[PDB]
Amino acid sequence: APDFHDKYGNAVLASGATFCVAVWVYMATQIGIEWNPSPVGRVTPKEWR
Amino acid sequence: KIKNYQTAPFDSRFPNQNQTRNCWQNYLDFHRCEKAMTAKGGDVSVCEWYRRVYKSLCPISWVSTWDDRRAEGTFPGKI
Amino acid sequence: ASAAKGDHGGTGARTWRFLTFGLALPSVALCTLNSWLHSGHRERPAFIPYHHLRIRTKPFSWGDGNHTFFHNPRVNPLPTGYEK
Amino acid sequence: HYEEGPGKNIPFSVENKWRLLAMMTLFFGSGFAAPFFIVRHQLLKK
Amino acid sequence: FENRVAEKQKLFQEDNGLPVHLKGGATDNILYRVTMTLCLGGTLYSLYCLGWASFPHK
Amino acid sequence: MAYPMQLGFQDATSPIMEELLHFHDHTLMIVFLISSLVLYIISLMLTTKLTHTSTMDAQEVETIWTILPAIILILIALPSLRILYMMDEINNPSLTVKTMGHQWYWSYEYTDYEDLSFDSYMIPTSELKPGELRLLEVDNRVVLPMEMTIRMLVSSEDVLHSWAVPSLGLKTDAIPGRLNQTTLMSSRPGLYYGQCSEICGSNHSFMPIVLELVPLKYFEKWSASML
Amino acid sequence: HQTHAYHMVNPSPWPLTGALSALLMTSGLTMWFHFNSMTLLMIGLTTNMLTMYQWWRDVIRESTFQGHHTPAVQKGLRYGMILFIISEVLFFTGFFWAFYHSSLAPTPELGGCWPPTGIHPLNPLEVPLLNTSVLLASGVSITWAHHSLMEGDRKHMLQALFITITLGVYFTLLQASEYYEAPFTISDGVYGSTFFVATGFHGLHVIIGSTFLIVCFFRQLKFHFTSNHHFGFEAAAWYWHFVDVVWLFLYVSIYWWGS
Amino acid sequence: SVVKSEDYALPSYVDRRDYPLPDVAHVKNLSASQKALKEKEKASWSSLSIDEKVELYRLKFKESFAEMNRSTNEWKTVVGAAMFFIGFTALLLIWEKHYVYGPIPHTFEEEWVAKQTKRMLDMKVAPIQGFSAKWDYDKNEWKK
Amino acid sequence: MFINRWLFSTNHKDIGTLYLLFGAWAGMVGTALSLLIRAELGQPGTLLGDDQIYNVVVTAHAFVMIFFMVMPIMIGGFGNWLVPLMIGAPDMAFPRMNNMSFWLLPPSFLLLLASSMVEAGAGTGWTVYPPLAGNLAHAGASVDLTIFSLHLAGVSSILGAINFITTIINMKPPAMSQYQTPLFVWSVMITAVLLLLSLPVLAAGITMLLTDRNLNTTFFDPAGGGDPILYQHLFWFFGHPEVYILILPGFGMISHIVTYYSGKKEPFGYMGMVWAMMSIGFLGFIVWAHHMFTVGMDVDTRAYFTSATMIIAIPTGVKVFSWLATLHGGNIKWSPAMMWALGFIFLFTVGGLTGIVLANSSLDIVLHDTYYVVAHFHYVLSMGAVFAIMGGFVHWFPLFSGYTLNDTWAKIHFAIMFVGVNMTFFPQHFLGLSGMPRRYSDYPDAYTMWNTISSMGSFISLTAVMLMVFIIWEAFASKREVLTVDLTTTNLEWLNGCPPPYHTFEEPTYVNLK
Amino acid sequence: ITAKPAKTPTSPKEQAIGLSVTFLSFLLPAGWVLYHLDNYKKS
Amino acid sequence: ASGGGVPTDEEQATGLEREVMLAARKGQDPYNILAPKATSGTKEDPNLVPSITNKRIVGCICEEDNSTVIWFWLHKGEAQRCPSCGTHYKLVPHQLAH
Amino acid sequence: HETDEEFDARWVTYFNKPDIDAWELRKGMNTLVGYDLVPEPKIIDAALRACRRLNDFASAVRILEVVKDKAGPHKEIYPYVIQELRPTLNELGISTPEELGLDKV
Amino acid sequence: STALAKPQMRGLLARRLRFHIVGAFMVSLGFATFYKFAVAEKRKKAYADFYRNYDSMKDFEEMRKAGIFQSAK
Ligand SMILES: CCCCCCCCCCCCCCCCCC(=O)OCC(COC(=O)CCCCCCCCCCCCCCCCC)OC(=O)CCCCCCCCCCCCCCCCC
Ligand code: HEA
Ligand SMILES: CCCCC/C=C/C/C=C/C/C=C\C/C=C\CCCC(=O)O[C@H](COC(=O)CCCCCCCCCCCCCCCCC)COP(=O)(O)OCCN
Ligand SMILES: CCCCCC/C=C\CCCCCCCCCC(=O)O[C@H](COC(=O)CCCCCCCCCCCCCCC)COP(=O)(O)OC[C@@H](O)CO
Ligand SMILES: CCCCCCCCCCO[C@@H]1OC(CO)[C@@H](O[C@H]2OC(CO)[C@@H](O)[C@H](O)[C@@H]2O)[C@@H](O)[C@H]1O
Ligand code: CUA
Ligand SMILES: [Cu+2]
Ligand SMILES: [Mg+2]
Ligand code: NA
Ligand SMILES: [Zn+2]
């Protein structure tokens, strides 16, 4: 006699994971959060003086 | 005579991080010297070393406060 | 130390009462004599407005804010010197 | 003497799950809200 | 003076359901009601004082 | 200064900060060893169906687990304390400088010969010049000669502050009525940044420290022009 | 019915009123220091005395009148009282630490010496020596009171106890007088700070210990104590020796060595 | 058969690997057929059938070792729901960024960052390992 | 009925219940304060506009978590409920004084809240150093309300310590020696001895602060010859013992949890565990100046305190090891409480190792007053003390209430929290090595990335705390009543059923001398 | 530990509601203060 | 220097404190102040556990210096055994206060 | 301590007690599975015979499941024990948990 | 049909623990080698290489020309 996990486990796993990834990826990349990563290898320095 | 001063040298009487009393002793030394000289007729310039040392080590606001208290007669150290 | 006396066989009420009237109270009478003899007023010392004394970083919560709680006019100066 | 047993040895009632939910909400909710209201009070005082 | 401890033992051991703080009689209650009123009034007053002190009195 | 996504210490600027880097590496290797060992032992205790739930004997195994940590502690303490005493060693400085904390800015006094003193405030963000560092720059930097032993004396005129410059391995609290000494030696010229490190009120986050380290000749000309 | 020997206490309002009385006293002291007003303070002192009076009355009811202090219960009270004295020692220890800290390294603002420039210390051979003899003599008479009680002698106990209380009051009067006559005050820097806070807290403890002895006095007038069961009196004697010892340390540290 | 809360002082049944023989039988009240079965267990066990041997097992014990030790799918629900609530948290962060946080300081503008990086290279920030050590001062580019 | 039972209590269980309710509500207040700290820091710039308000929030976060959440729940809550049930005692020695320990805490909490309401609050840090705490930098009533708050909490704990020590030494079965009492009881006894010794020194110090502020004393004021550094000695003389007081009852609970869910009948090395706790208790009184390695003390003093502090690892690792050895050969039951305990054992070790790094006065010069200190102590408090509290709460909840939790929900709760705390505090090591100060409302731009991440982590732990509320509701909503408990022959507190009756051991237990 | 079945079972639906109301009791009041922080700042 | 007037416990002790004093004087321990002495604990010589109801909790220290005590309810009826060392205990109900 | 052979003998003797009751049967097995070992067939043999004296078929099967359980991942222990016990199983009519279908979840 | 040989039946938990505690150690020792090669030794060498031909006047001169100093234009 199959329990809650036997009937719903796989569906909870797959869609919890899918949801979590999508909403974190969106938040981290689309809403203007300034992460301020290392300039090394990424920024071209410009004259400041 | 024996000057050529850069800054106050190490003083084995005050070997730790807390130098509060190094400022204080030199300030008293100088003024005790200056009393003895100026009174008993002599040269203040023997007192000079103490003066150099305390100028180096003592915050300006401390020296300045203590000067005023000497003028005022409320300086608590024994001169 | 063992003192200069003796009894140590019975430490009963009797011994302790003996000590009360024979040693304890007489010492008190003697220190009282020594006292009501060295008493009588010291000529109060001159006022010097030293900055480490007569501290007022906030006024006291009674009187005029400037007098300590057992202020004695004869021996305690205000920050501005003795009172009249 | 006092009542004994599950749901009886606590100063709040668990007779009705929904009144209990309301009680819990107020109780924890007022704890968690309070510092936000203290910050507001401090911004508004000047 | 006289030793009246046995009479108080009998009073305080009377099986009348009263808790110890009310068992000596009518004065216990008055003493109890007074304490409790000054405590609760005092606390309400101190919350009032707090409310007063929480805003500037410019 | 710190740079973005930094994991570990600022590059050492003074020999003492360099000693601390190597001592930190030695200590962290131990830490990694111990915590990984503990994690490994846990996963090991939890991955078998074999059981043994009757009484076990404690006194034998307890030696390993007392003697070992004890040898390891000694291995950290020896070098720790060697560095401690080195930070204290008779040094003979060439220059003494005083710094006084205030709410919220530092003032500096160079009074070996003349009476040079001045105030050092954070530059507000709206006044920064392009390429200048938000919250770090001051209006008047602490100019010092490179490659010399300098005695800093630290105190305060109001509450506690703390004078720190991570790159040089320096942090000394500023306590009113007290003069704390530390010694500063830079191996390189340049600009070295620090920040008040004892909570002092509203603007604790905003009274930074900038050292400017240059050749002696330049230090002398600078000092004369600051009177 | 129980078959252990310990005491299940009847539900009591005194915890709550002593806790609220603590609220009113600390609030009231804040009103007093900052909003110049003594009202809340006065109310808190009042509910606090009422709570102590009713609480300790009930403990006497439970023990002298209802018989709940079995030897197991009595052992507990012994431990409670020793532990409480220990906490009071550490409390005073913070004040002796403050005194030694300040006096073993006097700072420049004092004149760099101890006693500071400008302070004129009391002479330790005068009234302070007399106070010392007062409290020591009262440690002897209170031991006489304890032995008299153990031997069943009602009259001598009351007499010894009365002497002890009088010596205590006398110390308190000498000390008030000394406070009034002292040429330095609590505002006179760290010297007056450590002096008056350390001796002041000790003076408060002498008044609490005298009050405790007076409560024992009346209970003994009423025959509450037996020659064997008298914990209220023993607790009061230990607390009175404690106050005597703290005085000896103050006298050697602050009056004598620090003059 | 039916366990009661008020029997906390009496021995009870447990299924545990390390306590294989519990203090009481799982079934203590016997039907007529179950009594005749227990009579039969007093004779030779070769006489019992497989079905009767099972039934005897099930009067004495509730779960077999295989049953009590079975693994479940609970881990999926746990990890799944945990990821759900973790994704739910990202919503609160989105809300926070959109309605509570104002603009960040002008020192994160791209041009400010490019100038500040040059100035940090000029002053040789972390020239031994951390930062300028990664810049090539001759070729004027980041070390590849 | 209600007033007699709940305001006039003399019953160790109901008083323990009140403490649990009190601490859980203080938990909510401390959590919202921590979220405000992380909101101010979760992007560059200023959010509050008011840096005095930031310092007020940081100070209150700390007092609320230590004095009103951790110590009421562990000592007042678990200690009241469990200690008499573990030694077969009919109540505490002083059951009416005990109720005053409890009732002193709401008025104490009220004073702390009042201090943030009046003037500009107490923005001092939880150490409340002068002169910042003095009557010029902090004029007005806030710091004085704070000091009085601490007085009432110190009196509540000192009377509680006297209760627990007397009970534990005096009310055991006449045949049971101290070496036959469970580890949790030892942990509470030893904690009570630290509280009894160290709280009066705290009280003496804040009293001297109060008089400097209001009676023209100058204990701490260089103008009258006083010394701000004397305050730090008095405060840390209490404050080191205070950290060990926060962790030791959690050590006692962890031993019971790991033993229980390993199916063992006793912890490994019972006398080594008792030895280690006494040793930590003893050493925790002689190490306090490691909180003062930058104030300018002599080099020898600093070498001694580095050395004394490192010794503490030895008895501590004995416990860590004995927990593991208890697991060894267990029949492991993967219950939610056991998951909290395993997380305790690992994370507490990480936090203890960073404490060893900080114990070197050399290296501490550069880490002091940085976020590396904040990382260290949140590892041992928010992942040691708090994980022990959650473990103890899920394990003993059916004893206290008579109802079971949904274990699946409880495991989800653990998973979310575990992710949240690690994401919040782990990056703080980078911030402190790289030189970011503690107690800052804003930071130079380079520190942005770690701060951003750390603030996001903090919202994940929020999600967990809300869920925990829901979990408790679901359990009282559903009313699954307890039937059977395993391992009662070595866990006496479960032997009276769930919940036990009001009076338990009216007839005491029978134990032969032999 | 073993337990009886729920005396007042809480269905999936009832859990949705208790979870939701719990979450909102924490989120709405804080959200309101935070949302308006800016009106309190210059004001 | 000598007279009386202080009551004795014998004269004045009351309630539970009196009950304990009088029972102690007859060598009885109705309030469980002393540790009971073990018998051989065999089936024919069980530990007799007095009680005022029909069950009492026994803690067995199976071997000297165990740190762990084995706890179990003893019910009225036949002797029961410690689950760990097997020694025997038998409940003897009743009486205590008359 | 005691040697392997001594320990084994002690447990054989324990279960061989002719008037062993059900309490002592339970106590012995539940104590034995506390050790870091799978018991020797001769111990198991004595324990199965004690079950036959107590007329308890069900405990005899439980004892076989516990032996398999104690072996943990060492799959070769249980088939060797069943081999050594096969004559006693045949003689007393004891079915194995696998023969009863009790090994399948 | 052939009899099975008698397998090891005692101390199986103790034997598993003996085997793996060695492994626990080894990892550590061979890791130790790793922290101390990839990090610590690398650090000593970074510093020593940098300072071996370092010229602080030349470094100063490049900074001065970049316009960084207040005291030295
Ligand atoms: C959340 C953000 C993380 C960002 C990661 C780094 C980015 C790489 C850049 C890209 C890499 C580029 C290479 C440049 C190297 C710079 C060298 C240096 O200067 O730096 C010195 C550094 C460098 O040390 C490191 O070299 C990084 C340490 C990472 C530790 C591994 C655990 C990672 C776990 C998960 C993180 C969060 C969640 C839970 C954490 C769990 C708690 C441990 O700074 C530290 O001191 C931090 C350590 C704090 C003390 C922690 C004590 C024990 C921790 C855990 C024990 C686990 C053992 C078993 C093994 C445990 C396996 C699980
Ligand atoms: C529960 C609270 C808690 C606990 C238990 C501890 C435990 C320790 N703490 Fe912590 N600490 C705090 C809470 C706590 N701390 C707090 C709140 C602060 C900040 C106060 C403030 O400023 O606001 C602080 C600050 C602090 C400082 C001040 C740093 C500074 O301000 O610059 C120091 C320095 O010595 C220190 C060290 C230690 C040490 C050495 C231990 C040790 O007791 C740890 C021992 C544990 C282990 C070592 C791991 C287990 C052992 C093994 C697996 C065995 C083998 C190990 C080795 C051989 C190394 N702590
Ligand atoms: C006769 C000796 C008996 C002493 C007691 C009786 C006197 C009045 C009340 C005080 C008792 C309370 C505690 C003592 C603390 C403060 C110091 C009091 C010692 C004292 O009485 O000092 C007086 C100062 O008094 C002052 O300010 C007094 C101001 C009164 C303010 C009360 C202080 C409020 C502080 C309460 C702190 C409470 C916290 C305790 C914590 C409890 C532990 C948890 C000395 O007088 P002066 O004029 O400065 O010098 C003499 C010059 N001729
Ligand atoms: C203006 C003056 C007031 C200022 C504020 C405080 C002042 C008042 C304090 C005076 C202390 C009085 C305490 C009286 C206690 C009376 C009750 C009592 O003494 O109870 C006794 C038990 O002891 C017990 O609980 C022992 C209970 C002991 C408590 C002792 C506590 C000292 C209190 C210190 C208070 C504050 C400390 C200050 C810190 C700032 C009863 O047992 P027995 O004596 O064996 O009787 C039984 C026999 O008769 C049977 O045959
Ligand atoms: C650290 C813990 C904080 C965690 C994050 C909090 C998560 C937020 C949940 C939202 O709560 C609210 O949402 C609003 C809208 O987004 C607000 O409405 C405001 O916004 C409106 C439109 O944008 C108007 O409808 C209204 O008047 C209103 O005041 C506001 O009241 C508030 O209750
Ligand atoms: Cu100045 Cu912080
Ligand atoms: Cu510490
Ligand atoms: Mg600091
Ligand atoms: Na900010
Ligand atoms: Zn036994």
Coordinates of C-alpha atoms in Angstrom, one line a residue, chain E residues 1-5 8-10 12-13 18-25 27-28 31-32 34-36 38-40 42-46 49-50 52-53, chain G residues 10-14 16-17 20-21 23-24 27 31 35 37 39-40 43 46-47 50-51 53-54 57-58 61-62 64-67 154 221-224:
Chain E
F1 CA 6.1 36.3 77.3
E2 CA 4.4 33.0 76.7
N3 CA 4.9 30.3 74.3
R4 CA 1.8 30.4 72.0
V5 CA 3.4 28.3 69.2
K8 CA -0.6 29.0 65.7
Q9 CA 0.2 25.4 64.6
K10 CA -3.4 24.5 65.1
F12 CA -2.2 27.1 60.2
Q13 CA -2.9 23.3 60.0
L18 CA -6.8 28.1 52.0
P19 CA -3.2 28.5 50.6
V20 CA -0.6 29.5 53.2
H21 CA -0.6 33.2 52.2
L22 CA -4.4 33.6 53.1
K23 CA -4.6 31.2 55.9
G24 CA -4.1 33.7 58.8
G25 CA -7.4 35.2 58.1
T27 CA -5.8 40.6 57.3
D28 CA -3.9 38.3 54.9
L31 CA -2.4 42.9 52.8
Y32 CA -2.6 40.7 49.6
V34 CA -3.1 46.1 48.7
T35 CA 0.2 44.6 47.4
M36 CA -1.4 43.4 44.3
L38 CA 0.0 48.9 44.1
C39 CA 1.9 46.4 41.8
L40 CA -0.5 46.5 39.0
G42 CA 2.5 50.9 39.6
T43 CA 3.1 48.9 36.4
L44 CA 0.4 50.7 34.5
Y45 CA 1.9 54.0 35.6
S46 CA 5.4 52.9 34.5
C49 CA 5.8 56.9 31.8
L50 CA 7.5 54.9 29.1
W52 CA 5.7 59.7 27.7
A53 CA 9.5 59.3 27.5
Chain G
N10 CA 1.2 26.2 47.8
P11 CA 0.8 28.4 44.6
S12 CA 2.0 31.9 45.7
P13 CA 1.6 35.5 44.4
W14 CA 4.9 36.8 45.9
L16 CA 5.1 37.9 40.6
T17 CA 4.8 40.9 43.0
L20 CA 6.9 43.6 39.4
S21 CA 8.4 45.5 42.4
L23 CA 10.4 46.6 37.5
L24 CA 9.1 49.6 39.5
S27 CA 12.0 52.2 36.3
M31 CA 12.6 58.4 36.5
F35 CA 12.9 63.0 34.8
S37 CA 10.8 62.3 40.1
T39 CA 7.1 58.6 42.6
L40 CA 7.7 55.3 40.8
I43 CA 6.0 52.8 45.0
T46 CA 6.9 49.9 49.0
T47 CA 5.7 46.8 47.0
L50 CA 5.4 44.1 51.3
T51 CA 6.6 41.2 49.1
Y53 CA 7.4 40.7 54.5
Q54 CA 4.7 38.3 53.2
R57 CA 6.2 35.3 56.8
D58 CA 4.8 32.5 54.8
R61 CA 4.2 29.7 58.6
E62 CA 5.3 26.6 56.6
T64 CA 7.4 26.8 62.5
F65 CA 3.6 26.4 62.2
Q66 CA 3.1 23.6 59.6
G67 CA 6.2 21.4 60.1
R154 CA 16.4 31.5 76.5
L221 CA 10.9 36.2 71.9
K222 CA 8.0 34.2 70.4
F223 CA 9.6 30.8 71.1
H224 CA 9.8 29.8 67.4

